[PDB]
Short mmCIF file of all heavy atoms in Angstrom, two decimals:
data_model
loop_
_atom_site.label_atom_id
_atom_site.label_comp_id
_atom_site.label_asym_id
_atom_site.label_seq_id
_atom_site.Cartn_x
_atom_site.Cartn_y
_atom_site.Cartn_z
N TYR A 1 -11.53 60.80 -54.50
CA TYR A 1 -12.58 59.94 -53.97
C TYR A 1 -12.02 58.61 -53.48
O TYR A 1 -12.46 58.09 -52.45
CB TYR A 1 -13.65 59.70 -55.03
CG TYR A 1 -14.61 60.85 -55.25
CD1 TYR A 1 -15.08 61.13 -56.52
CD2 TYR A 1 -15.03 61.65 -54.21
CE1 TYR A 1 -15.94 62.18 -56.75
CE2 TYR A 1 -15.89 62.70 -54.42
CZ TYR A 1 -16.35 62.96 -55.69
OH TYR A 1 -17.21 64.00 -55.91
N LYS A 2 -11.08 58.02 -54.22
CA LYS A 2 -10.50 56.75 -53.80
C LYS A 2 -9.71 56.92 -52.50
O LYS A 2 -9.87 56.13 -51.56
CB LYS A 2 -9.62 56.19 -54.91
CG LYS A 2 -10.43 55.74 -56.12
CD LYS A 2 -9.54 55.29 -57.28
CE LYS A 2 -9.23 53.80 -57.25
NZ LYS A 2 -10.43 52.93 -57.09
N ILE A 3 -8.87 57.95 -52.43
CA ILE A 3 -8.16 58.25 -51.19
C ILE A 3 -9.14 58.42 -50.05
O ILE A 3 -8.93 57.93 -48.93
CB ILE A 3 -7.27 59.49 -51.36
CG1 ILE A 3 -6.05 59.16 -52.22
CG2 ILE A 3 -6.84 60.02 -50.00
CD1 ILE A 3 -5.29 60.38 -52.68
N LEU A 4 -10.23 59.16 -50.30
CA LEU A 4 -11.19 59.48 -49.25
C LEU A 4 -11.94 58.25 -48.77
O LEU A 4 -12.18 58.08 -47.57
CB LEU A 4 -12.15 60.54 -49.78
CG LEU A 4 -12.83 61.47 -48.79
CD1 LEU A 4 -11.82 62.29 -48.00
CD2 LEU A 4 -13.77 62.40 -49.55
N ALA A 5 -12.32 57.37 -49.70
CA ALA A 5 -12.96 56.12 -49.31
C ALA A 5 -12.00 55.26 -48.49
O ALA A 5 -12.42 54.62 -47.52
CB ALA A 5 -13.43 55.36 -50.55
N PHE A 6 -10.72 55.24 -48.87
CA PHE A 6 -9.74 54.51 -48.07
C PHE A 6 -9.66 55.08 -46.65
O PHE A 6 -9.69 54.34 -45.66
CB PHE A 6 -8.37 54.57 -48.75
CG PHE A 6 -7.32 53.70 -48.12
CD1 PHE A 6 -7.63 52.44 -47.65
CD2 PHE A 6 -6.02 54.15 -48.01
CE1 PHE A 6 -6.66 51.65 -47.07
CE2 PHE A 6 -5.04 53.36 -47.44
CZ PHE A 6 -5.36 52.11 -46.97
N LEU A 7 -9.58 56.41 -46.55
CA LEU A 7 -9.52 57.06 -45.25
C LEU A 7 -10.73 56.69 -44.40
O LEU A 7 -10.60 56.34 -43.22
CB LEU A 7 -9.43 58.58 -45.44
CG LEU A 7 -9.12 59.47 -44.24
CD1 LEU A 7 -8.81 60.88 -44.73
CD2 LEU A 7 -10.26 59.51 -43.23
N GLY A 8 -11.92 56.77 -44.99
CA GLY A 8 -13.13 56.48 -44.23
C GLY A 8 -13.21 55.02 -43.82
O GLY A 8 -13.64 54.71 -42.70
N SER A 9 -12.81 54.11 -44.70
CA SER A 9 -12.81 52.69 -44.36
C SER A 9 -11.82 52.38 -43.25
O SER A 9 -12.04 51.45 -42.46
CB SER A 9 -12.50 51.85 -45.60
OG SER A 9 -11.15 52.04 -46.01
N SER A 10 -10.72 53.14 -43.18
CA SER A 10 -9.71 52.88 -42.16
C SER A 10 -10.31 52.89 -40.76
O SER A 10 -10.13 51.93 -39.99
CB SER A 10 -8.59 53.91 -42.26
OG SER A 10 -8.89 55.06 -41.48
N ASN A 11 -11.03 53.95 -40.40
CA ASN A 11 -11.42 54.23 -39.02
C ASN A 11 -12.93 54.17 -38.82
O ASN A 11 -13.50 54.99 -38.09
CB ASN A 11 -10.88 55.59 -38.58
CG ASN A 11 -11.19 56.69 -39.57
OD1 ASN A 11 -11.68 56.44 -40.67
ND2 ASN A 11 -10.92 57.93 -39.18
N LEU A 12 -13.61 53.22 -39.45
CA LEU A 12 -15.05 53.09 -39.28
C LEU A 12 -15.37 52.40 -37.96
O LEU A 12 -14.70 51.44 -37.57
CB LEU A 12 -15.67 52.32 -40.44
CG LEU A 12 -15.15 50.91 -40.75
CD1 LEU A 12 -15.71 49.86 -39.79
CD2 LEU A 12 -15.48 50.53 -42.18
N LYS A 13 -16.38 52.91 -37.27
CA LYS A 13 -16.81 52.39 -35.98
C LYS A 13 -18.08 51.56 -36.14
O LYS A 13 -19.07 52.05 -36.69
CB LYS A 13 -17.07 53.53 -34.98
CG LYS A 13 -15.85 54.40 -34.69
CD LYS A 13 -14.79 53.63 -33.93
CE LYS A 13 -13.64 54.54 -33.53
NZ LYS A 13 -12.44 53.77 -33.12
N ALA A 14 -18.04 50.32 -35.67
CA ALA A 14 -19.25 49.51 -35.62
C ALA A 14 -20.21 50.07 -34.57
O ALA A 14 -19.80 50.54 -33.51
CB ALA A 14 -18.91 48.05 -35.31
N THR A 15 -21.50 49.99 -34.88
CA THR A 15 -22.51 50.60 -34.04
C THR A 15 -22.80 49.74 -32.81
O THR A 15 -22.54 48.54 -32.81
CB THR A 15 -23.80 50.81 -34.83
OG1 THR A 15 -24.37 49.54 -35.16
CG2 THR A 15 -23.52 51.59 -36.11
N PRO A 16 -23.34 50.35 -31.74
CA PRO A 16 -23.68 49.55 -30.55
C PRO A 16 -24.63 48.41 -30.85
O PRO A 16 -24.59 47.38 -30.16
CB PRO A 16 -24.31 50.58 -29.61
CG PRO A 16 -23.73 51.89 -30.04
CD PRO A 16 -23.56 51.79 -31.53
N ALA A 17 -25.51 48.57 -31.84
CA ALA A 17 -26.39 47.47 -32.23
C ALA A 17 -25.59 46.21 -32.55
O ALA A 17 -26.05 45.10 -32.27
CB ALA A 17 -27.25 47.88 -33.42
N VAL A 18 -24.41 46.37 -33.14
CA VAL A 18 -23.54 45.22 -33.39
C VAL A 18 -23.25 44.50 -32.08
O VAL A 18 -23.30 43.26 -32.00
CB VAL A 18 -22.24 45.66 -34.09
CG1 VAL A 18 -21.38 44.45 -34.43
CG2 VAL A 18 -22.55 46.46 -35.34
N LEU A 19 -22.93 45.26 -31.03
CA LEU A 19 -22.63 44.66 -29.74
C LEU A 19 -23.86 43.98 -29.14
O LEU A 19 -23.78 42.85 -28.65
CB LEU A 19 -22.08 45.72 -28.78
CG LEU A 19 -20.64 46.20 -29.00
CD1 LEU A 19 -20.44 46.79 -30.39
CD2 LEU A 19 -20.26 47.21 -27.93
N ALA A 20 -25.00 44.66 -29.18
CA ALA A 20 -26.18 44.17 -28.47
C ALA A 20 -26.84 43.02 -29.23
O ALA A 20 -27.11 41.96 -28.66
CB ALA A 20 -27.17 45.30 -28.25
N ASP A 21 -27.11 43.22 -30.52
CA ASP A 21 -27.83 42.23 -31.33
C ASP A 21 -27.03 41.92 -32.59
O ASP A 21 -26.43 42.81 -33.19
CB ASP A 21 -29.23 42.74 -31.72
CG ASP A 21 -30.25 41.63 -31.81
OD1 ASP A 21 -29.88 40.45 -31.65
OD2 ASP A 21 -31.44 41.93 -32.05
N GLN A 22 -27.03 40.64 -32.97
CA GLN A 22 -26.26 40.16 -34.11
C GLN A 22 -27.08 40.02 -35.38
O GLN A 22 -26.52 39.63 -36.41
CB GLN A 22 -25.62 38.81 -33.77
CG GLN A 22 -24.47 38.89 -32.78
CD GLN A 22 -24.92 39.22 -31.37
OE1 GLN A 22 -24.52 40.24 -30.80
NE2 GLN A 22 -25.77 38.37 -30.80
N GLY A 23 -28.38 40.33 -35.34
CA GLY A 23 -29.21 40.08 -36.51
C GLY A 23 -28.79 40.89 -37.72
O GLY A 23 -28.59 40.34 -38.81
N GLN A 24 -28.64 42.20 -37.55
CA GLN A 24 -28.16 43.09 -38.61
C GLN A 24 -27.14 44.06 -38.02
O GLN A 24 -27.51 45.11 -37.49
CB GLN A 24 -29.31 43.85 -39.26
CG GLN A 24 -28.90 44.64 -40.49
CD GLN A 24 -30.09 45.20 -41.25
OE1 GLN A 24 -30.93 44.45 -41.75
NE2 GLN A 24 -30.16 46.52 -41.35
#
């Protein structure tokens, strides 16, 4: 689980909402 959480955290993509709106 720790290895897997590290793997997932490595390559996480921010959502387009991040680009469009900064509220959440």
Side-chain angles (χ1 to χ4, degrees):
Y1 283 144
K2 291 175 91 50
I3 287 167
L4 206 60
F6 188 40
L7 190 169
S9 68
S10 88
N11 50 351
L12 57 78
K13 299 292 186 196
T15 67
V18 184
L19 285 59
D21 213 357
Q22 288 71 240
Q24 188 170 298

